[PDB]
Amino acid sequence: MIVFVRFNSSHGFPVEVDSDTSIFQLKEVVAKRQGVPADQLRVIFAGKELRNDWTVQNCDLDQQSIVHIVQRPWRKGQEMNATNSFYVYCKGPCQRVQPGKLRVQCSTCRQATLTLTQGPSCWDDVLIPNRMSGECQSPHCPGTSAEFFFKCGAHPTSDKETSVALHLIATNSRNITCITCTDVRSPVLVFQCNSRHVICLDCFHLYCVTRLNDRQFVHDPQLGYSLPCVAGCPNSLIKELHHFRILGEEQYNRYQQYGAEECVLQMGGVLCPRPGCGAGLLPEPDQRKVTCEGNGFAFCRECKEAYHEGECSAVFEYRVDERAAEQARWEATTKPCPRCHVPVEKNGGCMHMKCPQPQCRLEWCWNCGCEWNRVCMGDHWFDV
Ligand SMILES: [Cl-]
Ligand SMILES: [Zn+2]
Ligand SMILES: [Zn+2]
Ligand SMILES: [Zn+2]
Ligand SMILES: [Zn+2]
Ligand SMILES: [Zn+2]
Ligand SMILES: [Zn+2]
Ligand SMILES: [Zn+2]
Ligand SMILES: [Zn+2]
């Protein structure tokens, strides 16, 4: 039997398998061929992962079936009881999603001298420019607006070393199951569909990579290229396109080239099949021999294999579970003062509490029950 494998490409190479071939054996074939460790490969068929112990027969794979192989090792270990509210994409040295550190400065002088009127309580407070007011303590600075910024929390960072905040990503303290895999994972990405469908980051990576391989990204005139909720919910395209950086450098670079590749294809062009040089080529409309040239092998335009004369070889190239979708919906009192023990109610999302008792006036963290400090401020200034 011949199956087609798409690995970091929109072109699927043929692989010979038998009814008794396991998915693990298929991964071993692709591992040696690509020089990539076998235990890092994931096989995806019609938007679903195929398990190592399943055979080709168990999977119901037929002649000319297209499977995706994506390089992403499964990591079981996670932190379900995490305290952090925020996530950033650290572009150096982590090169991945990490818990973030929230900081504030004066939007005028850029010093950490802005005394906020009140602490932030929501994403809008820290993402929308000039939303929060205060007074700058620096001599003669008329600064009245706060400027928030985030940094990676996994290692020290300079005051200039910012990382982009990932507003869709949240600590899964609600223990909501993933829409695709039904597992309870943390952190999760929350789609902005009406149902606020939840996806784990492992599934989100597989979703994006297979959609890059199938060239199924959606073009929005006032947005660019993006993806909606995996369930196909209306008006759910990701607007904050920096969320695609969480796929890592190799995959984000493929995403960045999507538009230029789509323009070439729209003009009757073709993308080069060779792994490494996947450039948008513009040959002569009726020419079968396509040679790679702007600024490497000569391929047959029909079968996408090395240029041959005569016939091409005979060999040539999703719905979410209803109950899983309903379960994966993100949105479906008083504490004593740590010092004077007088109970107080938290009015909003801000974790910075201040005891109203005149002899006490202790500033404390609602979550930790400790005196307010820079660590609590950076890690969980407000609830998300
Ligand atoms: Cl976040
Ligand atoms: Zn980092
Ligand atoms: Zn200032
Ligand atoms: Zn999942
Ligand atoms: Zn949805
Ligand atoms: Zn080429
Ligand atoms: Zn051919
Ligand atoms: Zn008190
Ligand atoms: Zn705290």
Numbering used by the authors: 1 to 83, 144 to 353, 355 to 356, 361 to 382, 391 to 405, 414 to 465
Q: Could you give the paper's own sentences about this structure?
A:
Parkin is an RBR-type ubiquitin ligase which is characterized by RING1, inBetweenRING (IBR) and RING2 domains. Parkin has an N-terminal ubiquitin-like domain (Ubl) that shares 65% sequence similarity with ubiquitin, and a zinc-chelating RING0 domain immediately N-terminal to the RBR domains (Hristova et al, 2009).
In particular, one construct (UblR0RBR) that included the Ubl (residues 1–83) linked to RING0RBR (residues 144–465) showed autoinhibition similar to the wild-type protein, enhanced ubiquitination with phosphoubiquitin and the ability to ubiquitinate a potential mitochondrial substrate protein, Miro1 (Kazlauskaite et al, 2014a) (Fig1B). The crystal structure of UblR0RBR parkin was solved and refined to 1.8 Å, and comprises two molecules in the asymmetric unit. The structure has five domains: Ubl (1–76), RING0 (144–216), RING1 (228–327), IBR (328–377) and RING2 (415–465), and a repressor element (REP) (Fig1C). The primary contact is between the Ubl (β3, β5) and RING1 (helix H1) domains (Fig2A; Fig EV1). The core interface is stabilized by hydrophobic interactions mediated by I44 and V70 of the Ubl domain and L266, V269 and T270 of RING1 (Fig2A). This interaction is supported by several key salt bridges and hydrogen bonds including R42 (Ubl) with D262 at the N-terminus of helix H1 (RING1) and R6 and H68 (Ubl) with N273 and D274 at the C-terminus of helix H1. A salt bridge formed by R234 and E404 pinning the domains together is absent in the R0RBR structure, but present when the Ubl domain is attached. In the Ubl-bound structure, the side chains of H302 and E300 (and H227) are facing into the interface, while in the R0RBR structures, these residues are flipped out ∼180° away from the interface (Fig3C).
